[PDB]
């Protein structure tokens, strides 16, 4: 904190500083099988 200060005429906001300096499964298997399906689907070699 410094010495000389705002003197007069109002404060609109107080400002929040104590958050800056004071700072310092099934779904994955489904995504896996979707990935394997798409990786097999770039060339299928079977469909007629």
CA-based nearest residue to 27, from 18, 19, 35, 17: 35
Cα angle for residues 42, 33, 39 (degrees, 5° grid): 15
User: Distance between CA atoms of 45 and 48, rounded to whole angstroms?
Assistant: 9
Q: How many residues bind another protein (CB under 8 A)?
A: 30
Binding of another protein at residue 22 (CB under 8 A)? no
3 lies in the site for another protein, by CB under 8 A: yes
**In the complex with another protein, which residue's Cβ is closer, 25 or 48?**
25
CB of 15 to another protein, least distance (A): 4
Does 45 bind another protein (CB under 8 A)? Our answer is no
């Amino acid at each position: 904190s410094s010495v000389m200060r705002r003197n007069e005429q109002l404060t609109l906001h107080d400002e929040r500083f104590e958050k800056f300096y004071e700072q310092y499964s099934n779904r994955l298997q489904e995504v896996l099988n979707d990935y394997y399906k798409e990786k097999a689907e770039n060339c299928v070699k079977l469909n007629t």
